């Protein structure tokens, strides 16, 4: 139903164990030192 | 050389707050990935807290809020600040630095926590003078004997650290009356015990008590 | 995880091949590392990712594995080589580490050195004796002690207190410490320490006079 300006898409390649990481407030290697969510967020991660 | 003087720390009454610092030579402690292990007496090492490079803390199970971690750019000086302790905490802790993946290590002396109720005393010093039955063609033994000190460490030293040799050392056991005794005997030749003057020294580093006992043959 | 080594008193003699297996609950990959502590002196990191020995190292020590079974092997058993060696998994939050195989080393006999000490005339006076009764250079750790009161069996009284191996000369140190009042010690007079080791010998008496 609703309508945004743009919709933004990351890609990135994570192994199974810090796919938790990438999410919102979350602290580790992986998203301390190479991707961060920010704090507020609507999106939706999706892992294959 | 990565050494360190990770020494702070002995004991408080139970619900107490000490303040451990750590220590560092050739490294930024706020560089390089560190962290806190914990040996209890006779049990395997346990994993309390650790740093990261850009600040990132992490505790275990048994420390979440009565333990804190920080760290200092100024002095090195890994700071762990140990708050709302209990009687089941006393236990060896050991500064470490580890770097993650290529490898090297740097795990310093580390520092003795025993926090209980009991109050401090001093040690009993007492000689153990060799008796005449000592073998007169063979090599006598005499050694200086230490009775009920609270807490530990305690080190035992002979001729201010010249004699390393026939050193024996016995482990500390626990009396019923909850304070440790240990007992140092050396081995010398007997061509020595009338031209060469043998003393213990026994230290005690938290109540700093300095005790010099000369021996003599008898 | 749930760390696990299986070999807890494992004992070779001089220059042997012996082999430490670390076992986890899920897959480590291979981020185990290999520590060795010895007695009183820091671990020290000796296999890191479980298939690179550090340099400086001596050359023996040597590891392999991945997922969830780990083995620690050891070239040449050197006698200043006595330690407890434990086994570390650095990437998974809940660090846990490993229960330790306190290794030894393993000779002949040897004939002990039986001494033994009289109390002080100030700690008699000050109403408490102490009777300590000296074992050295002994094999092993276990042997047979025992006190005698009044020709009866005694048991709940004795102490002992056994120094760990040493790392050149793998002789062992044995200490008993008795501890008595004022008045238990003016009214007896005998007191003997007797310890049969596994050399057969004669048994050990020890005598000693109040006036010398």
Same mark, same amino acid.
């Given at each position: 139903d609703l309508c945004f300006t743009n919709v933004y898409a990351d890609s990135f390649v994570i192994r199974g164990n810090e796919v938790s990481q990438i999410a919102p407030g979350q602290t580790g290697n992986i998203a301390d030192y190479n991707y961060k969510l920010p704090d507020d967020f609507t999106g939706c991660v999706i892992a294959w | 050389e990565v050494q360190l003087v990770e020494s702070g720390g002995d004991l408080v009454?139970?619900?107490?707050? /000490?303040? /451990?610092?750590?220590?560092?030579?050739?490294?930024? $402690?706020?560089?390089? %990935?560190? !962290?806190?292990?914990?040996?209890?007496?006779?049990?395997? /090492?346990?994993?309390?807290?650790?740093? %990261?490079?850009?600040?990132?803390?992490?505790?275990?199970?048994?420390?979440?809020?009565?333990f804190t971690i920080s760290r200092d750019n100024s002095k090195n000086t890994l700071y762990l600040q140990m708050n709302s302790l209990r009687a089941?905490?006393?236990?060896?802790? %050991?500064?470490?630095?580890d770097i993650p993946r290529h490898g090297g290590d740097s795990w310093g002396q580390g520092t003795l926590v025993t926090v209980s109720s009991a109050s401090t005393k001093g040690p009993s010093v007492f000689p153990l003078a060799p008796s005449s039955?000592?073998?007169?063609?063979?090599?006598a033994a005499l050694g200086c004997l230490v009775k009920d000190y609270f807490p530990?460490?305690?080190?035992? !030293?002979?001729? +201010?650290?010249?004699?390393?040799?026939? $050193?024996?050392?016995?482990?500390? #056991?626990?009396?019923?009356?909850?304070?440790? +005794?240990?007992?140092? #005997? #050396?081995?010398?030749?007997?061509? +020595? /015990?009338?031209?060469?003057? %043998?003393?213990?020294? $026994?230290?005690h580093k938290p109540s700093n008590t300095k005790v010099d006992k000369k021996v003599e043959p008898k | 995880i749930r760390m696990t080594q299986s070999p807890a008193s494992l004992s070779a003699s001089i220059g042997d091949r012996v082999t430490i297996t670390c076992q986890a609950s899920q897959d480590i990959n291979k981020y185990l590392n290999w520590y060795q502590q010895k007695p009183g002196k820091a671990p020290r990191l000796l296999i890191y990712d479980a298939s690179n020995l550090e340099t400086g190292v001596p050359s023996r020590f040597s590891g392999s594995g991945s997922g969830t079974?780990?083995?620690?092997?050891?070239?040449?058993?050197?006698?200043?080589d006595i330690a407890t060696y434990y086994c570390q998994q650095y990437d998974n939050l809940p660090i846990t580490f490993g229960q330790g195989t306190?290794?030894?080393?393993?000779?002949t006999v040897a004939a002990p050195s039986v001494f033994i000490f009289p109390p002080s005339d100030e700690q008699?006076?000050?109403?408490?004796?102490?009777?300590?009764?000296?074992?050295?250079?002994?094999?092993?750790?276990?042997?047979?002690?025992?006190?005698?009161?009044?020709?009866?069996?005694?048991?709940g009284?004795?102490?002992?207190?056994?120094?760990?191996?040493?790392?050149?000369?793998?002789?062992?140190?044995?200490?008993?410490?008795?501890?008595?009042?004022?008045?238990?010690?003016?009214?007896?007079?005998?007191?003997?320490?007797?310890?049969?080791?596994?050399?057969?010998?004669?048994?050990?008496?020890?005598?000693?006079?109040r006036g010398e």
């Open positions: - | 009454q139970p619900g107490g707050s /000490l303040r /451990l610092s750590c220590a560092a030579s050739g490294f930024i $402690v706020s560089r390089n %990935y560190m !962290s806190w292990v914990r040996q209890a007496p006779g049990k395997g /090492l346990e994993w309390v807290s650790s740093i %990261y490079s850009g600040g990132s803390t992490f505790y275990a199970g048994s420390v979440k809020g009565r089941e905490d006393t236990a060896i802790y %050991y500064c470490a630095r039955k000592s073998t007169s063609g063979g090599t530990e460490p305690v080190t035992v !030293s002979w001729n +201010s650290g010249a004699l390393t040799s026939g $050193v024996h050392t016995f482990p500390a #056991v626990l009396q019923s009356s909850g304070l440790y +005794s240990l007992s140092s #005997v #050396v081995t010398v030749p007997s061509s +020595s /015990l009338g031209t060469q003057t %043998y003393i213990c020294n $026994v230290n | 079974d780990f083995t620690f092997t050891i070239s040449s058993l050197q006698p200043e306190r290794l030894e080393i393993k000779r008699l006076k000050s109403g408490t004796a102490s009777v300590v009764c000296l074992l050295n250079n002994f094999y092993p750790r276990e042997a047979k002690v025992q006190w005698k009161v009044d020709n009866a069996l005694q048991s009284n004795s102490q002992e207190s056994v120094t760990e191996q040493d790392s050149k000369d793998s002789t062992y140190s044995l200490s008993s410490t008795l501890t008595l009042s004022k008045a238990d010690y003016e009214k007896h007079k005998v007191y003997a320490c007797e310890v049969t080791h596994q050399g057969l010998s004669s048994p050990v008496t020890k005598s000693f006079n």
